[PDB]
Structures are given as C-alpha cells and as structure tokens.
Design a protein around this ligand. Sequence first.
Ligand SMILES: NC(=O)c1ccc[n+]([C@@H]2O[C@H](COP(=O)([O-])OP(=O)(O)OC[C@H]3O[C@@H](n4cnc5c(N)ncnc54)[C@H](O)[C@@H]3O)[C@@H](O)[C@H]2O)c1
Ligand SMILES: NC(=O)c1ccc[n+]([C@@H]2O[C@H](COP(=O)([O-])OP(=O)(O)OC[C@H]3O[C@@H](n4cnc5c(N)ncnc54)[C@H](O)[C@@H]3O)[C@@H](O)[C@H]2O)c1
Ligand SMILES: NC(=O)c1ccc[n+]([C@@H]2O[C@H](COP(=O)([O-])OP(=O)(O)OC[C@H]3O[C@@H](n4cnc5c(N)ncnc54)[C@H](O)[C@@H]3O)[C@@H](O)[C@H]2O)c1
Ligand SMILES: NC(=O)c1ccc[n+]([C@@H]2O[C@H](COP(=O)([O-])OP(=O)(O)OC[C@H]3O[C@@H](n4cnc5c(N)ncnc54)[C@H](O)[C@@H]3O)[C@@H](O)[C@H]2O)c1
Ligand SMILES: [Mg+2]
Ligand SMILES: [Mg+2]
Ligand SMILES: [Mg+2]
Ligand SMILES: [Mg+2]
Lengths: 292, 292, 292, 292
Amino acid sequence: GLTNPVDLYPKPPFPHQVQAPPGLASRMQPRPDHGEQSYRGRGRLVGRKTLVTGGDSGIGRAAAIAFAREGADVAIGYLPVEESDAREVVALIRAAGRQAVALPGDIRDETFCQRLVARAAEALGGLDILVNNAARQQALDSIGEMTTEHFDATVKTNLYGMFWITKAAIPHLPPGASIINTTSVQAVRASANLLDYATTKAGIIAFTRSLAKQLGPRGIRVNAVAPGPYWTPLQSSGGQPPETVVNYAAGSPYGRPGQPAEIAPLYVALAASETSYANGQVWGADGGLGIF
Amino acid sequence: GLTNPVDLYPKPPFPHQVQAPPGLASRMQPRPDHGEQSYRGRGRLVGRKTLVTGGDSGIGRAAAIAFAREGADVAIGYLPVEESDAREVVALIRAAGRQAVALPGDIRDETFCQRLVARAAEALGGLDILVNNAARQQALDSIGEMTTEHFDATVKTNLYGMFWITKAAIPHLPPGASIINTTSVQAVRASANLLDYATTKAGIIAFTRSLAKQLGPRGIRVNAVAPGPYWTPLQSSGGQPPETVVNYAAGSPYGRPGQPAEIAPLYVALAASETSYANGQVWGADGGLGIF
Amino acid sequence: GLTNPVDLYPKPPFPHQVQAPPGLASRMQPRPDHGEQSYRGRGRLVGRKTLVTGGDSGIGRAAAIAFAREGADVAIGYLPVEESDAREVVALIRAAGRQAVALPGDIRDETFCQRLVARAAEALGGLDILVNNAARQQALDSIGEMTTEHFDATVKTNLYGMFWITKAAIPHLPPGASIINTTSVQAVRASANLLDYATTKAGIIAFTRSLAKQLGPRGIRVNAVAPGPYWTPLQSSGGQPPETVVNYAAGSPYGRPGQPAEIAPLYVALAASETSYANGQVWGADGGLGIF
Amino acid sequence: GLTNPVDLYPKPPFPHQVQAPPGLASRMQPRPDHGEQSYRGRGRLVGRKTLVTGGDSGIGRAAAIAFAREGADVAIGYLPVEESDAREVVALIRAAGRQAVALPGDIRDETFCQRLVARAAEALGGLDILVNNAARQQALDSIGEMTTEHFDATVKTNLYGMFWITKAAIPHLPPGASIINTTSVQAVRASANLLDYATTKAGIIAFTRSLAKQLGPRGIRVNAVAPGPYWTPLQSSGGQPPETVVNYAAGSPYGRPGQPAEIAPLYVALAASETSYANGQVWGADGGLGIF
Ligand SMILES: NC(=O)c1ccc[n+]([C@@H]2O[C@H](COP(=O)([O-])OP(=O)(O)OC[C@H]3O[C@@H](n4cnc5c(N)ncnc54)[C@H](O)[C@@H]3O)[C@@H](O)[C@H]2O)c1
Ligand SMILES: NC(=O)c1ccc[n+]([C@@H]2O[C@H](COP(=O)([O-])OP(=O)(O)OC[C@H]3O[C@@H](n4cnc5c(N)ncnc54)[C@H](O)[C@@H]3O)[C@@H](O)[C@H]2O)c1
Ligand SMILES: NC(=O)c1ccc[n+]([C@@H]2O[C@H](COP(=O)([O-])OP(=O)(O)OC[C@H]3O[C@@H](n4cnc5c(N)ncnc54)[C@H](O)[C@@H]3O)[C@@H](O)[C@H]2O)c1
Ligand SMILES: NC(=O)c1ccc[n+]([C@@H]2O[C@H](COP(=O)([O-])OP(=O)(O)OC[C@H]3O[C@@H](n4cnc5c(N)ncnc54)[C@H](O)[C@@H]3O)[C@@H](O)[C@H]2O)c1
Ligand SMILES: [Mg+2]
Ligand SMILES: [Mg+2]
Ligand SMILES: [Mg+2]
Ligand SMILES: [Mg+2]
C-alpha cells in the first residue's frame, strides 16, 4: 500500500546531543532506524559475497542488513570503539541465515586495508560486492583552524583508504561484481564548514566514474550513492555543529532528515545483477534537495 | 549467480536499418529485449496503479512489463500506428495477472493529455505511478535545416505533453505516489545533431527537480531516469544517423548499447514505497559513460 | 587598487516595491547600477556589431553599455512599454561614440524575431555578437495555478524566441563571431516556485552546448552566462515574491545581490576575439553560491 | 577585427614526441604559444601582486605573461629542472616593466609551501592574486599499475600543495584579493587512464566552492578555471599516451588543441576588481567539448 513519506520518520527538533567521533548509533536520540524491523528481503542477492566499510552504524549498517536479507554474506569494517554497534549488525546478518565477518581496524593504515580485503575474501570464499562507505567528517569554520593533521585525516580516510581497499579488492572480483562508493551532496553543495570533507566527496565521484570506464570492459560495475542528510552518528560527533543537529533538515521539503533504512534500496539495486547497464553513475537520495 | 554484463546482450555492428518514426520494435534487427523472458517480479508494487507514456516499445515497454510483474495495474500511452507493438504489451500485462489499459493518442494535443489521465484513472480505479516517457527525437546536422515545425514538434511532445499530463494527474495522486520522467544523457552531452532534443531533455531535469520541491511536502516523489544508449525504435527512426545505428555504442566501455530490459529496475526502485527519501533525483544508466 | 566587493553595492533590506512586468529600472529602489559611471572601455571590441535582447534594463543594459564602451555598435531589443529605460541606453551607447539601434517588439512573435535580426544587421552593416538575454519570469507556488497560457508565455519567450532569433542570425555571422545566451542558477537550483522558468533555463544550457558543437567548425563560438541574484526589474515585477525582494540575497556570502554592472565583464570576455578556446561554456557569476 | 578560431593555431597530427616529466615547453613540436607575441595588456591589473605556481610553462606561463602585461608584479613557482623555461618567463615579466620573482621548489613539501608564500609576499611587498596551477598528471591504464607512490604523488601535488599554499597565503590577502585554482574537464570526463588525476581535479572544484563561501564574507574571491586540451609539456611527459599526443584533440569541434595563450583571458577576468560577483565559479575553456 501507499505510505506518506513526509511523516514516516521523526522530524526535528531533536534533543541537544553530542558524542566523541566516530560515535555510537545507540546513543543517538532518537535511535536511528537502519531497517532492523522494516526491511524484508526477496532473494535479490542470493550467495553474493560483500564487504561494507563502516557497516556498524548508519548508511553502511542499513546496506549490510539489506544485503544479508537479500541472501548475501556480509563482512563489515568499523573502528574498535564501535564494537557495541557492530555486534548488533553481525547478529542481524546471522539471524538472516547468512555469514557475517567482523573486521575492525583503521583504514588510514595501508597494511590494514590489505589485510581487511584478504581476510574478507578468505572468510567469505570470494568477494563480489565492495562498498566503500566509511568516512571522516569534522566541520571547521575556517581554513585557519584546519591543521595538516585535520586535512590529512580526512583525505587519508576518505580517499587513500578507498584507493587501497579498492586496489586490493579488484583481483578478487569476477565479471558480474559491483563496487559502490558512498559520496555526499557536499560534493556539489560544498559548505564553508566542510572544506576537506567536500573535497574528498567530489574526489570520490571522479574516482568512481574513471574506475567504471577502466573496469567496465572486465564486467565489473562501479557506482556511487549521494545521500542528503541522514540521521547517523557522523553528524552529532562533530560532522555538523550542535544547533544544526537539533534542527537537522528542518527546512527540507519533508521537514525531516532521512533515516538510513530509506537509502538501503539504492545499494541493493546497484548491486543486483539485473541492473546491468548502470555503471559510472551517481544516484542521489536527498529528500528533495535535488542535487544528484 | 554472477553474470558478465559485457556480452549479456548483442554488440555492433548491426544491420543497416531505418524506419519512419515512431517506428516499431518488431522491425529492429535484432529484436530488442524488453525483459519479456528475463524479468521476474517479487511483489514490489502490489496493487499500484500506473500510467506509462510510450509504453508500447523501448524503455517504457520494459517499465510496463516490470510494473505488471511486480503486481501493478498498467495503462500505456502510444501512437495509433504502434498498435502492433502495443498489443503485445497489453498481452504481457494481462499474462502477469494484472489489468492493462490501452490509451493511444497524440500528447501534443492538450485535450488528449487531459483525456489520457482521466481515462487511465477511471479504468484503474485511481493513479499513483505516472511515468512521462514518450519522446520525439529527430537528428539534424544544422539549425538551418530545423524548421519551426521540427522544433515545435520536439518541444510540444517532450515539454508541453509532460506539463499537461502531469498537471492533470496531480489531483489524482495520493501521498505515497511517484512521478518518474525519462530524460537523457543528451541533457549534458548535447550533441551537435540533437539541438532541440537536448534542450528538452535538460528542461525535463529542471522540471523534475522543481516539481519535487513543490510536491515533496504533499508526499509525492518526483524523479528522473537518464538513459545512455539503448536499442529502441527511437534511434533507428531518425533519432540517430543510419551509420551511427550500425555502430551504436561500439566505443562505450562494454562496446554495446543497452537493451531496455536493463533499465526497468530503475523505474521499479524509484516507484517502490521503501525508496522514500529519493525525491528530485536524476538516476543514470548509461553503461559507463558516467553522465548522471 | 583593491576594493572590498562585500560593501561595494547596496545590501538589504530594500523598500517594499512591486511593478507590473516587465517593469522599469528607473522605478526600483535603489536604482540599479548598470555601469553608467563605472565601466571604462579599453578597446576590446572595436568595430564589432552587436544585438542584445532585453538591452533596455538589467544585465542586458550592463552588457550593452560595456560593449559600446569597448568600441562595438549595439542594437537593443526590448518591449514597447520599456521605452523610457531603452532611450537612456541608446543615449549612452551613442555617447560612447558608437551606433545604437532601438528595436522594440515581442520575441514570442516569430515574424518579429526575423525582422529584429534583419533590421539589426541592415542598420549595423553586419552582425557578429548576438546576446539572447530577454526573459519572462513569473513565480507561481503550485502547478495547479499554472495555466497553459502561463507555461506557454515562459517557453515561447525563453526557448522559442531564442531559437528563432538565433536561426535568423546565423547566416549573418562570420568566422570569429560570438553568441552568448543568458541562463540562470535556476537551471540547477530549480526552486519550487519557478517550475516553467527553471525548465527553460536548463534548456538554454543544452541549446548553447549543442549549438557550440554545431558552429565551432564554422568558427562561431556559442557560450552562456549563469547569473545568481541581481538587482533588476525582473524580480520586483513578479519573478520573485515581495518578501524575497525586501530581503533579496541577504543570506548569500556577501549578504547582498549583485548589481548588473558586475556581470558585464563576463559578456565582454566571452565576446572578445582573444578568448578563442571558450566554446560551449557556462560561466557563472553568483556571488559565492557556487552553482556554475 | 574578426579572426577564425579554427585555424588560428596548429592542428594534429603532431610529431611523435615524449619527455620525462615535468618536461620543457621548448622541446615540444611545435613550440607552444603562451602569448609571448600576441598578448597586449590594457592596464587591467596595475600594481597587483601575483603568485602563480607552475608559471614556467603552459597555462601558468600564459597567465604570468598576461598578468605582467596588465601591470601586475609576478612571482612564479616551478621545479628546478625547468629553469630554462622559467628564465624566459622571468625575462618576459621584466620586459613588461614589472617585478619578477623566481621561486623554484617542490610543493609536495609542506615547509617549502610555507617558504614559497612567505618569500613571494616579502619580495612583492604583499600578495593579492594567488593562482594554484601546478599539477602532476601521469596516465596509467589500470589501477593494478598504480602504486601508492603514484597515487600519493598526484594527491600530494594537486590537493595537499594547494591546501598548504592557500592556508599560508590567506593571512596576506586583503579584501579585494583573488584566488584562482586550475582544475580540468577530467573532473567530469574522468577517463579510464586518469584515475588519480581526475579524483584530484574534482576535489579542487569542491575546495574552491567551499573556500569561496568561507572567504566571500572577508572580501576574497575564490574561483577555478577548467581547461580542455591544451598544448603543454604535462601532456607529452606522460599525462597522455604517446599516440594521443600525436592526434591530440583531433576529434574536437575545431579539430585542434588549445594553445595556452587562449586561456590567459580567463585568469585576467577572474582576477580583475570589476568582476566582483564572480565567486565560487568554475569557468571552462575547452574548445567546444562543453564541460564547464
Ligand atoms: N549522514 C549523512 O547526512 C550523510 C550525508 C551524505 C553522505 N554521507 C556519507 O555516508 C557514509 C556513511 O556515514 P554515515 O552518515 O552512515 O555515518 P556513520 O558514522 O554511521 O558511518 C561512518 C563510518 O565510518 C567508519 N570509519 C570512520 N573512520 C574510519 C577509519 N579511520 N577506519 C575505519 N572505519 C572508519 C566508522 O565505522 C563509521 O561507522 C559516509 O561516506 C558519509 O560521507 C552521510
Ligand atoms: N534509446 C535511447 O538511446 C535513449 C537514450 C536516452 C534517453 N532516451 C529516452 O527514452 C524514452 C523512451 O524512448 P525509447 O528510446 O524507449 O524509444 P521508443 O521509440 O521505444 O519510445 C518512445 C515512445 O514515444 C511515444 N511517442 C512519441 N511521440 C508521441 C506523441 N506525440 N504522442 C504520444 N506518444 C508519443 C511512442 O509511443 C514511442 O513508443 C524517451 O523519453 C527518450 O528521450 C532514450
Ligand atoms: N536578475 C536576476 O537575479 C537573474 C538571475 C539569473 C538569471 N537572470 C537572467 O538575466 C536575463 C536578463 O534579465 P534581468 O534580470 O536583467 O531583468 P530585466 O527585466 O532587466 O531584463 C529582462 C528583459 O527581457 C525583455 N523581455 C521580456 N519579455 C520579452 C518579450 N516577450 N519580448 C521581448 N523582450 C522581452 C525585456 O526587455 C526585459 O528588459 C534573463 O535571461 C534572466 O533569466 C536574471
Ligand atoms: N594541458 C591540458 O590539456 C590541461 C587540461 C586540463 C587541465 N590542465 C591543468 O593545467 C594546469 C597547468 O598544467 P599545464 O597543462 O599548463 O602543463 P605544464 O606542464 O606547463 O604545467 C604544470 C606545472 O606544474 C608544475 N609542478 C608539477 N609538479 C610540481 C611540484 N611537485 N612542485 C612544484 N611545481 C610542480 C611544473 O612547474 C609545471 O610547469 C594543471 O593544473 C593541469 O591540471 C591542463
Ligand atoms: Mg559507526
Ligand atoms: Mg513505440
Ligand atoms: Mg526592461
Ligand atoms: Mg613546466
């Protein structure tokens, strides 16, 4: 049946709240909806072998839950401090009857990126969906406040980590495989307070489009997803200022931010074998901002 | 299982072939694949009520087949000369166990656009997916060859028809409904020989994004699909020069054009109730050109 | 010397004000600055032969003044009710020592478009800069309020008029000539209240890019300019709602709208013979919105 | 007078030619035209104080020549091996009657970036035009060939160097100053063989747009220039495969690549004080490809 999207999920104002990054979904108010109850699989990805970075919380968690419910085995990356979020996702993947692999570690470390891919492929018996979804986002009002360490941390997480993981993954990927990279509306919106983050998110789009041309001839599709505002720990752990969290997305056409559950369908559609002429695309889901 | 997209469908060279517009799918060599055998529904749109313009052939036919197999009732628009293509789609909708409504007529006629919507809604018992997919595309190498009649025919079909149909449809659309407009990579690629067509396809994107902001607050989502090259009668009936048809998409990353079957998943995903934060988006499927 | 752009021109709030379209610059509060005092020519367009539609006021007036001061002869189009604005521009072109031609008439009339070009070329002794700058902009909050007459008036002014004038002009344009089309940030921003206008402005970009590919081989360059908010009669005569006029561009990085004087340099640079590899471009001047 | 842009400059085929990067303009066949004879200044930047990275050759050299001829003092960065190109630019700046400052060194070195800005500002008596134009571009057909050292060299040159130089420069820039960043059509075209380069060029655009929003309120404008193909040593020293150099831009609307002379007007126009509402823009000059 039909459902009105406007009031399907919570609207601001939200309680004043902050966490140290990367944060925990379980400490947000309200708790985000990653599709734990609502997502019903229909056999769209049976037997696929998936690695999702940042699969413990937020958009990556929603994708991991959906992939498992569609019949795919799922390895998740995350940072060690997020173990309490990650254990929930691992249990949900397993409750869908599929294999879950927990692979915590810092993707700014090149050797860890190599081990992440090797261990995921070994555990799953192969690899044929890669989702580069982990990110650092730390807002700063001025470039004068941005140290080299700040800029480097954002670029190493969001560009180098993706590069190393993707490079390590390609020798495993058979014809028919899919790579999906999470970008952001910030690639275009380029807010004053997200100078380094926006740089990396625009970079991710060109990386996606170039790699799609490179790998298309080998039968591997490479695509990106461009979210607008979603209710995740990235925002309340310093990705946005606190007043922005309280009134998050209040001025958007629905008057509310997205919940991660709502974007999982884009990841399933892009990975599915039937979506065979989608390559090099950036698919947006921004609730009416109309960016991608 | 995994399937290599590169050789899943035919590659050029194709036989020298030309038709008068709008053409018939059954006269193309090879016959296009709209998903007649391959598309399997999974209950994703049960009971939805759909109107697809240009649903007799090509991308619109692939969308109509998929919608019916996902459980939706489907009305199709087309031009009277296309009856032999259209009756096949009516039969496919009925073979999926759903109601089919055949509504031929010329969408450059404002009164016909009003009757099309009124008759579709009356026959289906409502309306909650509208796909503005019909188009005119007639390549010309120079503006000196483009008469006012040429320009007006393209603009009246691709902009005015969409405007009139959409305006008439909105009073029928409940919260939870979806409007999907087919645009083109030509909105950006803007080839020398498609001056009027490219103008209209860029126009369709801004129309989509503006209307998404108007209707989002009312719970209606408005999105666009941007195909790259697909094997359809629009291309061999004057949309492309004949030598381009012979070698169509030969230089693309897969070395082949898309078949309409491959893009149907985008229409299903955009219409599904679960894709509830996709509004004002343009989703491409261009086989690695990397436009949208 | 250096000048701070932030406070170079007036900032809101502006007096409550409205006019019947197309409006008069002389009735705005404050009066707009089209460069009447500030623009100093430097011989950049000596002997060029120009036609500017909407050259009586706003951006077109600023371009006409600059072209004349750079040594070009200038014909201007405008609507008859704007005679009092137009006579000022004609006097300023002539005070720069160049020829001015006043060509009032409605560009929605195909025969007038043909006469406009023929009379401009006859009077000037040729034609080698064409600026399609006239536009209709009438905001409406809902498609339900938008009659066919409303939509048609916007599309006929902004797309058909450009088509007819451009088609009539090309046989006059020698190698080295330039066509410049004014678009808008609305092509991308696509506000809810500018459904028809935004459609046409996106269309203008694809028209520009396609015609550039068509005419590049003949040595004719075709480019577009994408303004952000400028203080012109288009806004207070129904292009924007009244509260928007009072607080116009207050939230932008400078906190003020542009004055037409500020965008004239883009038109001069695009027309100049030295800018010989700019073809098919869209150059923005939006005061930090960062759209084009 | 009018000049036909099509045959104003050389067209392919060009001789088979390759150099080690960064290469020398003097070894290209034919020698590039940076405007040494053609560019005539008109007092548009009198007394400005400029730093151009990569000012020894190519687009940066054309900008440096034009800036000096418009009345600005010019410091140039370059790599020590390019001294024979750089000394010619120093001589051209001095022949225009302005001060030239030669500042060779490697912008991947953060301490050098700080010294570069400090020494330029000290020598010139201030700083008010900064052009981040240096780049690394090394084509590779596959990500398997791209070592971390390759990726890091491109990212450190094109993103970190820009970040460090810009951060060091801002405390010197008074209201009225301009920052201009050279990007590329590759930000959008994203070719298969330019995976790291295209990533950085898209990043540069978002960096530009974000910084424009930060600095606009302080009266500093930040813009980008997006060249299409130009005849420069970056291309024949590994930026393109050798067979592409031989046939460079043969299929474009003019059938020839740009010469650096042709793009200098964009840098002058963006820096000029009169262009006061251009902020956060990307202005293309791609010869009819129609990208930006
Ligand atoms: N939430 C939004 O509004 C929004 C908007 C646009 C784009 N995005 C994108 O969505 C993606 C997912 O973020 P999210 O919003 O779901 O938030 P999230 O905090 O739930 O997910 C980000 C994840 O990144 C991972 N991560 C961060 N640094 C890492 C490191 N050094 N090593 C390993 N893993 C690391 C963490 O595991 C974390 O869970 C990101 O790419 C982000 O850019 C989010
Ligand atoms: N095939 C491609 O390469 C391609 C590429 C990009 C975009 N598109 C878009 O795909 C959409 C569908 O076209 P297609 O390629 O499937 O070709 P198609 O010929 O199968 O479909 C176009 C349909 O338009 C309908 N139509 C045309 N003029 C009409 C009129 N006056 N009144 C009513 N109906 C009318 C016809 O019924 C026709 O079947 C179009 O919007 C087109 O712009 C196609
Ligand atoms: N002012 C802004 O904020 C803004 C922003 C983006 C784009 N633009 C564009 O700038 C261009 C110029 O408008 P402006 O803002 O300088 O306002 P303006 O009112 O000064 O100029 C518009 C002109 O259009 C002409 N015109 C309108 N309908 C016509 C018709 N039927 N026949 C002949 N001429 C007709 C009138 O002569 C009028 O002076 C337009 O193309 C507009 O889309 C303006
Ligand atoms: N030529 C083209 O076709 C083309 C196309 C699009 C964009 N671009 C852009 O144009 C800009 C200028 O390049 P060009 O084509 O004029 O070629 P070029 O080789 O003449 O200039 C590039 C310059 O970069 C400098 N450079 C490189 N690495 C450096 C380092 N580590 N430290 C200091 N300086 C360093 C060198 O001094 C060199 O002269 C670049 O940003 C490039 O991305 C060029
Ligand atoms: Mg987390
Ligand atoms: Mg048909
Ligand atoms: Mg006027
Ligand atoms: Mg050099």
